Amino acid sequence: HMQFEVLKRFFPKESLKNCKGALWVHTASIGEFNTFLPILKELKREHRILLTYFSPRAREYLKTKSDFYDCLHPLPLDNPFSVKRFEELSKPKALIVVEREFWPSLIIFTKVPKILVNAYAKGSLIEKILSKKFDLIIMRTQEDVEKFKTFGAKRVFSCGNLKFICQKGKGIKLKGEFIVAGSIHTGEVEIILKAFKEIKKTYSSLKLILVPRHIENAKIFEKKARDFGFKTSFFENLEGDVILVDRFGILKELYPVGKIAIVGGTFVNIGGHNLLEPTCWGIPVIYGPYTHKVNDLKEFLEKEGAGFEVKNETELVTKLTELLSVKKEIKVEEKSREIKGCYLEKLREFLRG
């Protein structure tokens, strides 16, 4: 089945010797790794990297990212001896913990200089006790900083949320004016078509590019839009009022083509997909009420004036019209350069000496 690597954790591999002096980066699982990746890309340039993870579900994925590290090993089991053997074999120059892997033996029984990034405070007793054990803490909010400072942590700063860093890609150019609806589920399709139908009464040249959450549904989606009375086409072919995308990936590259984006997983009870993507391009994003899985991101976008929650077909029409008549300025990308810059600055300085 899956590889738990229990022996490796308990008795870290001898070959760690071959990675001595590296910068040790710990990403509990795939999420943490992706969140830290933009920082890792830069650090990887000035340091050899020793990468560890906790979840067995992350091994296979991380193996595909060998470009971003020199050595890969699971985190040692949390006893003084496994942890000390890990540190003694690898003699790491420092350890960066992404988000909050409060492993007591790891934190208590290693001597490696320790750095926590993207942390937030909960006010719990384990925080009171272990926070002071880090040489440097970078938090998401100045509020979190305050709490940790009352915990006797020195060297604590706020740099913002690493999750809000833009990772854009090349992108695509298309002539025409478009709305781009991405990661749309079957149960979201009709409300969007009915909204776009109401809109086209006014904006006759406007086209909808529609990208299903599952590209397999590209044909069911087409037939629906056809049933609604739209001329339709499949991407590459831009002839339709509703343009369906059937090729995987591509979605993040399509956003720059539009004036307004709509992101699914939000009009049905899914919890929201990736709201950030379109806004990194200076485009406002509209979403439905079901954002519980991306709540921090939601509150961030609303504060940045870049995200807009709509409750129903009517609100959607109303919001779309507002954004088509008045171009909403978006500054998410500058914030992104700012968070990234702050994190990378403090880390480079800390690592310098």
* Binding-site positions: 212-213, 248-250, 274-277
Is 214 a binder of a copy of itself (CB under 8 A)?
yes
Active-site residue identified among 14, 32, 101, 146: 32
Nearer to Cl ion, 65 or 84 (CB): 84
123 to 142, contacts with a copy of itself by CB under 8 A? 124-126, 129
d(CA 122, CA 100): 11
Q: How many residues bind a copy of itself (CB under 8 A)?
A: 31
| Tokens found for residue 187 | 């149960």
- Asked if 187 touches a copy of itself (CB under 8 A), the answer is yes
49 makes contact, choosing from Cl ion, a copy of itself, none, with CB < 5 to 8 Å by partner type, with none
Give the CA distances from residue 220 to residues 192, 208, 224, in Å, rounded to whole numbers and listed in that order.
15, 16, 6
Choosing from 70, 88, 177, 190, the residue that interacts with a copy of itself (CB under 8 A) is 190
Minimum distance, C-beta of residue 215 to a copy of itself, in the bound complex (Å): 9
Q: Could you tell me which residues come within 8 angstroms of residue 85 by beta carbon, excluding any fewer than 6 positions away?
A: 11, 12, 76
Q: Which amino acid is at 40?
A: L
Out of 202, 269, 312, 314, point to the residue binding a copy of itself (CB under 8 A). 269
The reply on whether position 34 binds a copy of itself by CB under 8 A is: no
Q: Does 105 bind a copy of itself (CB under 8 A)?
A: yes
Active-site residue, 236 included: no
Radius of gyration of the chain (CA): 23
Q: Which of 26, 114, 185, 335 binds a copy of itself (CB under 8 A)?
A: 185
Known binding-site positions for CMP: 212-213, 248-250, 274-277
Q: Which is nearer to a copy of itself, 123 or 169 (CB)?
A: 123
Catalytic residues: 32
Point out which residues bind a copy of itself (CB under 8 A). Answer: 1, 4, 6-7, 10, 77-80, 100, 102-105, 122, 124-126, 129, 185-187, 190, 214, 216-217, 219-220, 224, 268-269
